[PDB]
Amino acid sequence: GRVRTKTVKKAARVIIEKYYTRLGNDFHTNKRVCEEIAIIPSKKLRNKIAGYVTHLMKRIQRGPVRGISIKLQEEERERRYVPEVSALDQEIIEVDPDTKEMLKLLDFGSLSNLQVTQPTVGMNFKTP
Amino acid sequence: MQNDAGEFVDLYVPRKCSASNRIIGAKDHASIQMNVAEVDKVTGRFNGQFKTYAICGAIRRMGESDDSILRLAKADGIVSKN
């Protein structure tokens, strides 16, 4: 089993929160990055840290990760909608007539952009 | 409270609820004090003066803070009279 333990995937994430301007997608660059940016004892931890920051940079640039901070949103405020006509600009709004009685008794409904539709017959809304 | 020389001898005078007039104690940690802002009558902008209401936490726990805020804002000219 090759599951990464707590230190090689917490330490890799605290390495990724700062120092994002140095990291990349290739493993052999980040492996050489990791000794200027940290004090790690011997290399098998450092190769495992480099493997997880390469896997995390493989993950992270196509969407949000839960564990990573809004330094991601600093990338999405650094790198990144409405329609032309709004979806609330429709020209006929169907209104079933209890709403029309409400609008008439709120001193509206003299103005007509709406169209009242026919009331339902049958009251079978419950489940058996 | 007030002894015969006229002195006010109490430590402090606690707030009372605006909905039930119960004494909001020192450790009624669910009680609120809410400011509701006034607006100017000609422009409809916030001009600096307030309305202040306090509700104790025991009224809030049974779901009755909303209706008392609606009644207290209705009676001081914030909610309309329909």
């Binding site: - | 909905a19 039930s20 007039n21 119960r22 025991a58 009224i59 009755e64």
Partner: protein, 129 residues
């Protein structure tokens, strides 16, 4: 069945006051309860009320600002002479500075400090504080 109507009226006041409600509805309406709630109103404890007239024994709708910690009844109505008033106001009241015992005397229904000032005693009705 229903006995001692004043007791069930004051338990209605107490249960609807402890929930912080603003108005109660009392049924039936004695002439005992209208003098009793006159006594509690004149001390500034309940405010105004209304006596709803059907042609039977009426109802009473009382306003409530909660100021009222406890409103109680004493049953049966024990005879309180004027030397037994201090033994009764030591038991039921929470303080020497406030609280009242209502007792029904030959000058009328009155509270316990007025009965010392009018120099009379009578049967006890209850208390409020």
């Amino acid at each position: 069945v229903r006995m001692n109507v004043l007791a069930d009226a004051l338990k209605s006041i107490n249960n609807a006051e402890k929930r912080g409600k603003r108005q109660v509805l009392i049924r039936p309406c004695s002439k005992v309860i209208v003098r009793f709630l006159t006594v509690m109103m004149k001390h500034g404890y309940i405010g105004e009320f209304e006596i709803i007239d059907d042609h039977r024994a009426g109802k009473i709708v009382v306003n409530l600002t909660g100021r009222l910690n406890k409103c109680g009844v004493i049953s049966p109505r024990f005879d309180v002479q004027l030397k037994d008033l201090e033994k009764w106001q030591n038991n039921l009241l929470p303080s020497r500075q406030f609280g009242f015992i209502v007792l029904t005397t030959s000058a009328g229904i009155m509270d316990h400090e007025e009965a010392r000032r009018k120099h009379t005693g009578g049967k006890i009705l209850g208390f409020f504080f």
